[PDB]
Point group: C2
Chain length 266, copies 2
């Protein structure tokens, strides 16, 4: 005979990382609203991470970002046009610089969503990491308004949580956005308000910064008569609610017994 239940040639089954799944659903969701996804460098200049986003030196707004400062000689940190950029080096504290980046290299109107690994000098506990992921949004063009920001988030929420879901917007402060705002989503099987991310209408001084950088690069102004809305949305938090993960520290851990648990998901 040939015992037909007898285990077969055990080949390797691959899998994706929790964050990858979550990042994916995220971009998939936004690309159906016409957002295209681009990435940026993890090692950034202070000019892109801070100055171009209206976060100035010795300003009390920089305390929202506990920053890793890097040193090192002979390291080409390439700018939006591949030009060699100078400036005091650091690790991205948010993906936000990518939108100054992108705006210099392209022209309105556009929709983009940018994922990335981001860094903060913070104490690794169970609901906090020193290294985690953000997903940015930027929609710039003539006529764009805050109604469209709300619309986007409303759309995000509908897709991540179903019809029984609703979104909440509250004023809050970011230097690179005014009117600024924090947004929360209502998740039915939890009866809970999720603080998801921050957002707003991209700040006049940001547009100014990019058009200025443009000139230095010899490019034409492109952001004098357009408006925009950006948002920043933290991904681990969201992945935790979705896959039911009790501890953020797991993501960076390497535990196969952990990773393997996600082979199924789609």
């Amino acid at each position: 005979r040939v015992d037909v239940s007898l285990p077969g040639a055990s080949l390797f089954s691959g899998g994706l990382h929790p964050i990858t799944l979550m990042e994916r659903e995220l971009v998939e969701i936004f690309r159906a609203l016409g957002y295209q996804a681009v990435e940026g460098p993890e090692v950034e200049s202070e000019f892109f991470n801070f100055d171009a986003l209206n976060i100035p030196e010795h300003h009390p707004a920089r305390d929202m970002w506990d920053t890793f400062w890097l040193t090192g000689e002979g390291f080409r940190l390439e700018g939006p046009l591949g030009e060699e950029v100078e400036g005091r080096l650091l690790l991205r504290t948010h993906t936000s610089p990518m939108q100054v980046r992108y705006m210099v290299a392209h022209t309105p109107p556009f929709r983009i969503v940018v994922p990335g690994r981001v860094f903060r000098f913070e104490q690794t506990d169970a609901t906090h990491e020193a290294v985690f992921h953000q997903l940015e949004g930027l929609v710039v063009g003539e006529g764009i308004a805050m109604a469209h920001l709300k619309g986007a988030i409303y759309e995000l929420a509908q897709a991540l949580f179903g019809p029984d879901s609703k979104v909440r917007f509250q004023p809050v402060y970011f230097p690179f956005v005014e009117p600024g705002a924090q947004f929360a989503v209502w998740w039915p099987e939890g009866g809970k308000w999720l603080e998801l991310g921050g957002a707003g209408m991209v700040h006049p001084k940001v547009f100014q910064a990019v058009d200025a950088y443009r000139e230095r690069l010899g490019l034409p102004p492109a952001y004098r008569g357009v408006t925009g809305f950006a948002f920043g949305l933290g991904v681990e938090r969201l992945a935790m609610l979705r896959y039911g993960i009790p501890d953020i520290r797991y993501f960076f851990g390497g535990r196969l017994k952990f990773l393997e648990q996600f082979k199924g998901v789609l």
Copy 2:
């Protein structure tokens, strides 16, 4: 020693079928405009394939569709609501029925794109099949207009052919659409006008047909005060231009030496 160029354990490399690639790029393209993809049955009723699309019996418009008629006893052909449907059975001559299908089961506004295998009694040569694939579009809702149909196609063309591309619209006749139209795209590296598919503003008698079927099913009217645009776009043709395939007969052929040639593509 250990000769390190010496071929390694030869494992199996998989691949996708030319049509699958083309179907995919297609849906990917349209899902970024907010179209969602649904499918329909390959075995259809005359009511869905013809009557509900304003293609009546012994009408000279049915000659655009050389049809396979099926016979057979004890075969549940399930309708939009899973209800057992009756009617003279055939093979889909186009994917178009799917939009009557969908409209009965859902309510406006929506964007859908429907791929499918479709059949025609025709002589298998090099630029013709008896079995090939179509990709349908349907965008229905308040305010929808022909400008939006053109916009869609313009968008399709931009993405399949680059900026140097342009689209051409000419009046043409379909019973399920008026104003009706054929559309062609301009493909630069070919200096050629591609006749891609047909389209138009979904016909008043179609909306009427679905709302009528709805009543029979006990559902409420949903298409009295909405407009719509559909399009039908043949996929093999497009795949042939893209992957450079000289002969449609290859798609249904099974030649590994042929299929294997497409493992790379993305």
